[PDB]
Each structure stands twice: as structure tokens, then as C-alpha cells.
Amino acid sequence: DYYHATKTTIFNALLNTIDLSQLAQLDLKQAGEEIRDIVAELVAIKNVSMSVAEQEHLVQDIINDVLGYGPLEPLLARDDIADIMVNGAHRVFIEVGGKVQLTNVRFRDNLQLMNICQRIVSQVGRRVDESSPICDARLPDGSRVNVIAPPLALDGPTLTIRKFKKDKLTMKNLVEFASISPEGARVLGVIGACRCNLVISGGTGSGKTTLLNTMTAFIDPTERVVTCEDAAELQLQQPHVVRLETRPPNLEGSGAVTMRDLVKNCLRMRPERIIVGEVRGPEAFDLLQAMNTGHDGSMGTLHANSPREAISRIESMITMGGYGLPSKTIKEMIVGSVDVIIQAARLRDGSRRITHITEVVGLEGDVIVTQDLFVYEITGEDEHGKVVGKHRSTGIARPRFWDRARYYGLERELAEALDAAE
Amino acid sequence: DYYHATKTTIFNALLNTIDLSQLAQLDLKQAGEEIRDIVAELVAIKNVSMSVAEQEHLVQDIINDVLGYGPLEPLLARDDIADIMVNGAHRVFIEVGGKVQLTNVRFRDNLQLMNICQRIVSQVGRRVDESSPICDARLPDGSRVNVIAPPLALDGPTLTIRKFKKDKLTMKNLVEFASISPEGARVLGVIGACRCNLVISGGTGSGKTTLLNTMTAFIDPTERVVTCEDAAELQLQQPHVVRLETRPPNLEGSGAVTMRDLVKNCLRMRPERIIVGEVRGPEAFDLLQAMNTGHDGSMGTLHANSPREAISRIESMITMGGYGLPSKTIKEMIVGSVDVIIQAARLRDGSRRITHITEVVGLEGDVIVTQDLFVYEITGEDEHGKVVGKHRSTGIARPRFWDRARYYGLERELAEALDAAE
Numbered sequence A, B: 001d002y003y004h005a006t007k008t009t010i011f012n013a014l015l016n017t018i019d020l021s022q023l024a025q026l027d028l029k030q031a032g033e034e035i036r037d038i039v040a041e042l043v044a045i046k047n048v049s050m051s052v053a054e055q056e057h058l059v060q061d062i063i064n065d066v067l068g069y070g071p072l073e074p075l076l077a078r079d080d081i082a083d084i085m086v087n088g089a090h091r092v093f094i095e096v097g098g099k100v101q102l103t104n105v106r107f108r109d110n111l112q113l114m115n116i117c118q119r120i121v122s123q124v125g126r127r128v129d130e131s132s133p134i135c136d137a138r139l140p141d142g143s144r145v146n147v148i149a150p151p152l153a154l155d156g157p158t159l160t161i162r163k164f165k166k167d168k169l170t171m172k173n174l175v176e177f178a179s180i181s182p183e184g185a186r187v188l189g190v191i192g193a194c195r196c197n198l199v200i201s202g203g204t205g206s207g208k209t210t211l212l213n214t215m216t217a218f219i220d221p222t223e224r225v226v227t228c229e230d231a232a233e234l235q236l237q238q239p240h241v242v243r244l245e246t247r248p249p250n251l252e253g254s255g256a257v258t259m260r261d262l263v264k265n266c267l268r269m270r271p272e273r274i275i276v277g278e279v280r281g282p283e284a285f286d287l288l289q290a291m292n293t294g295h296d297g298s299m300g301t302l303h304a305n306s307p308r309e310a311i312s313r314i315e316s317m318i319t320m321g322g323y324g325l326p327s328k329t330i331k332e333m334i335v336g337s338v339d340v341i342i343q344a345a346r347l348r349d350g351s352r353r354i355t356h357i358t359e360v361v362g363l364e365g366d367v368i369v370t371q372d373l374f375v376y377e378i379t380g381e382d383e384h385g386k387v388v389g390k391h392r393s394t395g396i397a398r399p400r401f402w403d404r405a406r407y408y409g410l411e412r413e414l415a416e417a418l419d420a421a422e
């Protein structure tokens, strides 16, 4: 109580003493030093009866509130905390050891929480407010931040921070986790090596980026690969890799470098493969053009819960991408460009699997016909609640991309894998 | 070590001695002479013992770093080096003999690399920086330069210099490489000299542009040729040639001059032939129009793995133009415009082959009918792994374009070559 009252009085005095805009104009170190000096002066003026440690703690709290992330700072610093959920200014939950717990942390009010959320989202050039209540982003340290504004979040601004996991999986791990059978792993190796235009669809948090990172491991080291991303997630191991990242528009609305611009430039950097960190806009069109004009092996990842939905989503993205084209034009462009679709999915038990490996066979009339080389069949459930299933090959001995395999001498391995998991 | 340490010390002394702005004001010759004199004086003062050749090499390197393009200079000098790709200050690949390879060339740091890139772009007036991180330009000597600034390129500024190839393969070379048999070479010469409408399709890296450049050697000197290219690659030897290049939009999205606009104008420039570097968009329509409207002999490369795929790609490209043309109308336009399609493919063993020389016979209901005059048949593969095959004439004695050959007086050569290949 006494500490809280002293902190409130000191904050009010500081607010009445200086304007936050001036400090914001200053650097973090200079602003923090000035805030500490002003807080010490205010404490001396008020003759607050507290220890030097209490004064330092109050100064640190004031500095964090003015420019830091407020009460989240101790939680963000902590490593064991995997997730932080703030359901309004007065409810803060943290995930520790896989269990959600209610912390005593509290914000001053929904306005302070909204300011903190706006700071966090702007840290990556994103803006959240009444006009744009919802904002999802990925911070540079790899944590995912989701924010909803009061207009939608009835009980106050809602914030979710999912902190980055250190480790990253490999195809061997996926085989171990039963995400894909060994024959499926071999077929994926053939698909990646033989320069097949890939689309790695999947639901949110279903392993799209991890699967793409594993797939890139099959690219030949000699190939010049150009990776475009919004958050710099991939960790390709090849020597000749060019890592590009989009630049979101500044607060003035200028300086934007969308993924479409990155892909258009990539067409002029003499790459062999263009790897888009995630297709969500007009770049799809360009990417498909890249797939269909000599940049074979270009891989992208897409948000879709099934290959059919992935194809429909790609068609829509091309449609809204400025250019007005016939639906059949876009459909046959997709058919010509995309060779394989891999459906990463999350099961009802929360586990992750590679449900579909599918070929874009062709276009019949106005319907894109595809064939599933590999499908995951769920056959029940275990005693612990975990889903139970198995990956089975559809038995297609000659997939549409067989020629590509022949071009690289991988046709023998493709046949072996397709036969060994019938 | 000793040489590197001496070079570093000399560079530091020169930086502390001569102002960069003053040297920039001075001309290249005077600046170089002053820099050489200052470096010699500094070496004498430092009492550094080195050979005359070593001292001259160090002075030249220092001058290049101060004024030239630093370690990038020798790579530009070498003729055999086609492309130079710098991914950050520590990695430099060069395309030699058509294969990319890493080089021990390393820049001092990313700041030096960015400075060199800025100087290179400014040489043609363009400027690249954080405000405009992406810069694509054509140097006066014809080399294309693409630069990506650090904010987009995570690993440091990315540079791509595609040098213009001085010498290009001729039809004699293609005959030597067994790409086309001598009878096929004669038939191609007849097709080129007959002002036959042409489309040179092909797969990735299949030599479409090289084949087009070879075929343009048959154009009569007196014809007024007009060339449209996204990137200047063709080198026609005729006297009356007009070379045009598209201008991609700046980052502001302004000033774009698409290849469609270039061909639209070319229809007004009173040409005898229009040579489109590569048809990959709506420009197809305009190109096809040029073929209908008396500009007989127009050529254009296209990405496709077979003549049927080339025709389908042309239809799709025409549909992309926004005109409400039905499919039947587009097929009729293609049949009436295109005369011969040359499909060049790259085989498994890396060999280039002119797989097909096929006419566009006509249009049955909904289906374009083509007849292959010349076909490359693969009989298998030798124990060395190379694909074994031969070029065979289909036996069509009177090609659809026979009348044009008779008009130009080449019909007898055409018949002789077709019979000999038979």
C-alpha cells in the first residue's frame, strides 16, 4: 500500500514535471537517466521515507512505465514463462511448465495497458487502435504478439505473448515425432531435391515454417536460394543463400517494401529458388510466375487447412492482386506453376502431422484436379487421449513430377518410397 | 599477414591524411597520382620494406579502394566471369563457364560494400540507400546491376552484376555442339531468312535467348529490326536495329514502361521485324498483332517445355491482357499469327538440344493443330550417362511456310535440307 501510494505520487509528480514527448524524442539511455534524476529530486522534495533500494525500484518502475513495457518487464525477462496472457488491465496469466497460473501483476488501467500494447506492436512497425482493433505480429526475438482493442475486447485490451522456443526441429525429429512416416520423409526428400514447386499449406501453428525449414535442407548447396520473409524465421544451411526481409510502412505510411516487391526484385537477382516466408497477398501471383518462368523449386508457405482450400486461397490472392484476370486464367496459372502441396495440420489432441502430400494433376473445365500421393488416416484414439493414425501412400506409382525425378536420377528412390508405404 | 598489416596501416594513414571530399572533387587521374604519391611517402616514413612489385600492387589496391570498386575490380576485369553475386561483405560468387563458384574475394566490411554499391549505382545516376533500398540499373557498358540495401538484406547489402556477354554462340557452334543437325541448321536458316513468324519456346536454361540471337543472324541487313527486352541480352549485327528496354517502376510505383507499351509503340515505329526478348505477359497479344499486320518475321522467346505448352502459355498471356476475347478468338489469332515454333530443351546430362521445329498448321474445333517438321528423338543413354539421340525430319515435303520460301527463292534449299534430314 505505502509503496503503491508513493509510486503513484511520484508518477503524478513526474507527469506534472516533464512532458513524455520530450523524453520520447531523447534516446532510451538519456531519457532513463533524466527520469531517474527527476524521480530522485521528487522523492527528496516529498521526503519519502524509504530505503535506497526502494527508491531505485521506484525509479526503475517509473522508467519502465514511461518507456518500457510496464509490469510485463519482470515477466518478459523471466525465461521459464512460455506465454503471457493479459485479459484486460487487471488479469495477467502466465504459462509456467505448461500450466497457466494467475499472477498478482496488474496494470494501472486499460489505458496504460493499451499504451503498452501500442508500444509493443509499433516495435515492429505495426499499429493497433480503434480503427484497427486486431493486430498480430512477431517480435524480433521470435515471440508472437496478438492484441485486440477495447472496441472488440469488451473487458479491456487483450494481449497474448507467446515467447520464442529456442530449439528447432529437423526431418529426423519429424520422423521421430511420427509427423511423417520414413517413406513420407524419403518422398519429401525427393520432392525437395528434384526442384518441385512446393506450397506448404497448413493451419495456424501447424508447423508450416518448421516444415519449410526442413524442406529447404534438400536444396543443393550450389543453388543460389533467395529467401523472402516478414520476420526472418528460416535458418537455411546452404552456403549460397540470400536472406531478404520486408519493411513495413512507417507511421507516415511510406517506405513500405511489400513481399511483392521483394519477389519482383528476386526475379532480377539471378536465383535458382525463391523461398517466400509466407504467401498472404499479391506476391502469390508473382511467386507463381517465378515458379512458371524458370525458377523451379520455389517454395512458399500458405495458411490453409486443406490442399483444396490452399488452391482456393491462392486463386483469391491472385484475384485481389490488382490485375484483373479470368478465373480460368488464374486456375491454369496455378496448375502450371504449383507441382506439390504439403498439408501440415494440427490434430484434435494438439499434435502435428503432415496430413497430405498432393499433386496438382491438372485442370478439368473450371475445377483443378489433384491427386494425393500421401494421406494420413486417423484410425482411433489411445488411452491417454492422443490421436492415433497412420500415413499411407495412395499407390500412385508415377506422380506428375516423376519426370523431374528422372531429370535428377531420383526416380528410383521415388519409386522405392512410393512402393514401401502402400 | 605482413602485407595485410602494411595495407591496413597505409589505408589508415591515407584516410587520416587526405580528405575524401577533396579527392572526390579532383579528377580520377590527378586523384590517383596524389594518392600514389601519398602512399609512397607514407611507406617511406613507416620504414616498411617491400618489393617494388608488391609496393605497386598495394598502391593500386589502395587507389581502387579509395576510388575504384575495391576488390571487386579484378572480377570485373576478367572476361571469363559472367555474373558477380555478393551476398554481404564476406561472400562473393562468380559465374564462370556457366557454373557458379565461391571466391576468396572478401570485402573489408558491410560499410565498405555498401559504399562501393552506392558508387556503382551513382555511376549511372541512380542512388540506393535506406530510403530506396532496392536499385536496379543498367551500366553504360551494358552490365546490369541490382543492389539491395541492408535494411532489406539481413546479411548485408546484396549486389548482383550481370556482365554483358561480348561473344555469343553462332549457329555453327550449335551445330558443333550437336544441338541441331546441319540439315536442321539449314532449315533454321531458311526459316529465319523467309521472314517467318517465330516463337522460340524452351525450358529453364535451355538456351532460348542464345537460339534467338543465332536466328537473328539470318535477318536481311536492309530490314528495320526493333528489339524489346527486359534486360538487354541480344546482340544483332545488322545495321538497322533499334534496341529498346523496359523501365521497371521505381519504389514509388511510377514511371513503369512495360514491355506491352514497348511493343505497342513498336507497331508505330514502322519496323520490318519486332524481336521481343521474352514474352511473359499481355505483350504477347501485341506481338501477335505485329505478326498479323505485316511485320512478318517477328520473333519472341517464351518459357514452355513443348510447343503445345507454348501455345497454351500464349493463350493464357493474351487472356491476361484484359480484353474480353473468347478462347476461340485467341486461338484463331495464334493460328493466323504464329508460323513456326522452335522448342529447345536442356536434357538430363546438361546438353542443349533443339527438340522441335514445328509449324502451326491450323485450328480444328477448339484445338490448334501443329505438325513437327524436325524432331529430336532420344534412343537411350550411353554408358557415360550422356543422352544419345538424333535429329530427324518428319518427312513433310511442303511446310505450311513453303510459299514464303518460294517467294524469297529459298524453297529449293528448304526442300533439299528436309530431304537430307529424312
Ligand SMILES: Nc1ncnc2c1ncn2[C@@H]1O[C@H](COP(=O)(O)OP(=O)(O)OP(=O)(O)O)[C@@H](O)[C@H]1O
Pocket (backbone or CB within 6 Å): A165, A169, A174, A177, A179, A202, A203, A204, A205, A206, A207, A208, A209, A210, A211, A352, A353
Ligand atoms: N511436426 C512437429 N512436431 C512437433 N512440434 C512441432 C512440429 N512442427 C512444429 N512444432 C512446434 O510447434 C511450433 C509451431 O511453430 P511454426 O513456426 O512451426 O508454425 P507455423 O505453421 O509457421 O505457424 P504460424 O501460423 O504461427 O506461422 C514450432 O516452433 C515447434 O515448436
Ligand SMILES: Nc1ncnc2c1ncn2[C@@H]1O[C@H](COP(=O)(O)OP(=O)(O)O)[C@@H](O)[C@H]1O
Pocket (backbone or CB within 6 Å): B098, B169, B174, B177, B179, B202, B203, B204, B205, B206, B207, B208, B209, B210, B211, B352, B353
Ligand atoms: N545450344 C547450346 N549449346 C550449348 N550451350 C548453350 C546453348 N544455348 C545456350 N547455351 C548456354 O546457356 C547459357 C544460358 O542460356 P540462355 O541464353 O540463358 O537460355 P535461356 O534464355 O533460355 O535461359 C549461355 O551462357 C550459353 O552459353
Ligand SMILES: [Mg+2]
Pocket (backbone or CB within 6 Å): A208, A209, A210, A278
Ligand atoms: Mg510460420
Ligand SMILES: [Mg+2]
Pocket (backbone or CB within 6 Å): B208, B209, B210, B278, B301
Ligand atoms: Mg533468356
